[PDB]
Amino acid sequence: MIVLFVDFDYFYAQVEEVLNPSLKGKPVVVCVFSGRFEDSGAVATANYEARKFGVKAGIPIVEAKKILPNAVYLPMRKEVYQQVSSRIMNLLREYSEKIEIASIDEAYLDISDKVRDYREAYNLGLEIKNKILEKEKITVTVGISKNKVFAKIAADMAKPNGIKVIDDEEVKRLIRELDIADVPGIGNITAEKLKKLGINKLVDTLSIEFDKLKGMIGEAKAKYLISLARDEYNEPIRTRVRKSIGRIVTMKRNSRNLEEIKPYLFRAIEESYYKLDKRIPKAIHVVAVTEDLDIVSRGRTFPHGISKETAYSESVKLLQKILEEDERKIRRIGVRFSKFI
DNA sequence: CTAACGGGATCCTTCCCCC
DNA sequence: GGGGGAAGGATTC
Ligand SMILES: Cc1cn([C@H]2C[C@H](O)[C@@H](COP(=O)(O)OP(=O)(O)OP(=O)(O)O)O2)c(=O)[nH]c1=O
Numbered sequence A: 001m002i003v004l005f006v007d008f009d010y011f012y013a014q015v016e017e018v019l020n021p022s023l024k025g026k027p028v029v030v031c032v033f034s035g036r037f038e039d040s041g042a043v044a045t046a047n048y049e050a051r052k053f054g055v056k057a058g059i060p061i062v063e064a065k066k067i068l069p070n071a072v073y074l075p076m077r078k079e080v081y082q083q084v085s086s087r088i089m090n091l092l093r094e095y096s097e098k099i100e101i102a103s104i105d106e107a108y109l110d111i112s113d114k115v116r117d118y119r120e121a122y123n124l125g126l127e128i129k130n131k132i133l134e135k136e137k138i139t140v141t142v143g144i145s146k147n148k149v150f151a152k153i154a155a156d157m158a159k160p161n162g163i164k165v166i167d168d169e170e171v172k173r174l175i176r177e178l179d180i181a182d183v184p185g186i187g188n189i190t191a192e193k194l195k196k197l198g199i200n201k202l203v204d205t206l207s208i209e210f211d212k213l214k215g216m217i218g219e220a221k222a223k224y225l226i227s228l229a230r231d232e233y234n235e236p237i238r239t240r241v242r243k244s245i246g247r248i249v250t251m252k253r254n255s256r257n258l259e260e261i262k263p264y265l266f267r268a269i270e271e272s273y274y275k276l277d278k279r280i281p282k283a284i285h286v287v288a289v290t291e292d293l294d295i296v297s298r299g300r301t302f303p304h305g306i307s308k309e310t311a312y313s314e315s316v317k318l319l320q321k322i323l324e325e326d327e328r329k330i331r332r333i334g335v336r337f338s339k340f341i
Numbered sequence B: 001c002t003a004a005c006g007g008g009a010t011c012c013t014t015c016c017c018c019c
Numbered sequence C: 001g002g003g004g005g006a007a008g009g010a011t012t013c
């Protein structure tokens, strides 16, 4: 297998840069305002000019303005970014029928049937980089290797407008030397669990007893990491089908009053049913983010599709159950639909 | 009515009903 | 012993 992985660079900020090129060279920060107060919210992404000084995704807006008070702070316009993303994905489909769209800005291409070695796969990587910046003037990063995981690691390394190949021989040195926290699927809770077991490299998973590795990170992550360490990972590129659609809004103030929460729950349903855009769900989940950011959720499924009116009636019953069974004030209320037809 | 913070989605684990 | 569905967890974007 030769897998080609395309990852658009600083993508929300770069799209705003494309629609308004005067922004180029300046630090651009794309924020998600929450409306509790002024500048309440977080950073969706920033470009590298803003990232240089520590303004990156996740940190509060007010924190970013303390660091770069004169940066360009734009509100998030995600469906603008989605239509741009949709057009770029359609470009990628010319280079392989086997393609996996992983998120709004990442696609995996199986180029096994289109090139014979890495040298050609590298050249076609440049052909894709040019065509995207040709047709849409967006710089991307190409990562090429033998499986999805190392193709993504390659792109992580060359990330800002790069292209880089991890060959079979670098895969082996990476198995021995790459920090295991830098492996896709290993966040900090799992990474911290691995270090307390002594594992800091992928090869260490072969030396440890499986049951004690399984006992602390789970069966799936264990087989996953062992498979990578044995150089025997090879999940195929598959078309990913969106399995849920939802929306959760922050209330202007915390509450446990059913009548105060109901408008927000209903607006989540309105916006959620719009995003379904045709497509009928048979399962609904009411999702509450509590006082202290803890997410509670009650749902239920039906032998049939759910109309908007049933979504209204049932969300109230499911919301009542959340307050019946939890004592925390709710801070954000939302809804998720799944199990489509 | 301005208060130390978004939002969307996936896969997996755990528990419990059930064959 | 396992298949299945609900709610919680960890991840990533
Ligand atoms: C990391 C991250 C990204 N995003 C959004 C913003 C990005 O435009 C999009 C893809 O994110 P990423 O690909 O993870 O980051 P990026 O594209 O903005 O920067 P990079 O060049 O390093 O890839 O997802 C979030 O909303 N929250 C997050 O925590």
Ligand SMILES: [Ca+2]
Pocket: A007, A008, A105, A106
């Ligand atoms: Ca990415």
Ligand SMILES: [Ca+2]
Pocket: A007, A008, A009, A010, A011, A105
């Ligand atoms: Ca990206």
Ligand SMILES: [Ca+2]
Pocket: A181, A182, A183, A186, A187, A188, A191
């Ligand atoms: Ca990590």
